[PDB]
Amino acid sequence: SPKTILGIEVSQEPKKDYLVGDSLDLSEGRFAVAYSNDTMEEHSFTDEGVEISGYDAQKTGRQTLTLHYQGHEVSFDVLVSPKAALNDE
């Protein structure tokens, strides 16, 4: 049988931190969806169900963000910083 969802739960935390030449990379912005087959799935900045408005990818630095999904809206802030050393791959 097909696997679809029904109920949605907001589980995104404030962060939105991007490094120079790194572009977007939201990880705290994840949502938890409950399926009808008794299963839950979590993903950050993966699903295309949430649209962000106000964030300028062509210019970051203390920019406002507003995510809208279905009928809910959440506000957040983004801060861009210079890439650091020692990074795991």
Side-chain angles (χ1 to χ4, degrees):
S1 6
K3 171 171 278 97
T4 37
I5 68 112
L6 228 130
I8 187 267
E9 247 198 52
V10 58
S11 213
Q12 50 244 225
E13 284 213 306
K15 257 238 186 237
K16 267 85 103 79
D17 254 74
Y18 320 138
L19 275 302
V20 305
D22 225 76
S23 93
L24 273 139
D25 216 342
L26 180 55
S27 254
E28 283 236 311
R30 76 225 184 200
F31 73 112
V33 67
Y35 284 79
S36 213
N37 287 49
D38 208 47
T39 47
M40 278 152 222
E41 284 199 296
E42 72 101 68
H43 246 322
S44 349
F45 198 58
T46 343
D47 187 60
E48 274 249 283
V50 293
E51 288 232 309
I52 315 299
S53 247
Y55 149 81
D56 267 304
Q58 272 186 331
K59 242 157 165 234
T60 44
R62 204 251 251 191
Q63 321 298 0
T64 313
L65 298 87
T66 8
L67 83 90
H68 229 298
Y69 175 94
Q70 256 237 115
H72 253 288
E73 74 179 347
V74 189
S75 96
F76 281 121
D77 318 317
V78 68
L79 308 140
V80 63
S81 266
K83 62 177 199 123
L86 199 97
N87 252 241
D88 51 88
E89 301 212 85

